[PDB]
Amino acid sequence: AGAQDFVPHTADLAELAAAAGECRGCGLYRDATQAVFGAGGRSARIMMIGEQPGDKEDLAGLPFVGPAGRLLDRALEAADIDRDALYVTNAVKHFKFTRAAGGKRRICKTPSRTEVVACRPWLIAEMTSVEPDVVVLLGATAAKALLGNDFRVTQHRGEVLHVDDVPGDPALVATVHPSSLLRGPKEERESAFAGLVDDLRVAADVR
Ligand code: SF4
């Protein structure tokens, strides 16, 4: 059942994170430095979920510490959301990567659907533990983990969604991943930043 047996029977986030350090639910634990669990407390009303820890996250032991995390910090501030009141995590908790000759960083490789399904028990334990009012899904992998493998982030922008098989029926808001707004023509990046702010504001408004 993937990571299921590695998940202990607790809602204590420090205990879950320690256990995630021992997970072998898929092959990704082998080459990753460490498991990167979510950060934040169980009082959090807003949960945010990216794809996976990237290069910086793999070594920091924390989510959203890179350029993508800093852009998200700028978006959250513009949306009047405090990052300390958020629970932030990723669909899979081990960095999947390769290197290219001459590169300046390790390159993220897309988790397969199998890896996403294997690791989802941790996501479920996190949601059980935090009981968020709203889940922001940042990018396609995270959105598909909860909304199904055919889901298209691009076709449901700014929509409050609810699926039946999700812990605590929280509202779900699927949006672009902060990494997508780092490059491109200035006017498209600025339009996209506004869209992300809008989606974050939709999520924060959820009753
Ligand atoms: S990615 Fe998830 S399921 Fe795979 S080894 Fe890491 S914690 Fe376990």
Numbering used by the authors: 2 to 208
Sentences from the paper on this structure:
Structurally, UdgX is highly similar to family-4 UDGs (F4-UDGs).
Further, the overlay of all the structures of UdgX H109 mutants showed that the overall structures are very well conserved with a Cα RMSD of ca 0.2 Å. It suggested that the initial increase in UDG activity (H109K to H109Q to H109G) occurred because of the efficiency with which the water molecule could be localized to make a nucleophilic attack on the C1′ position. However, a further increase in the cavity size (H109S to H109C to H109A) perhaps destabilizes the bound water, thereby decreasing the UDG activity.
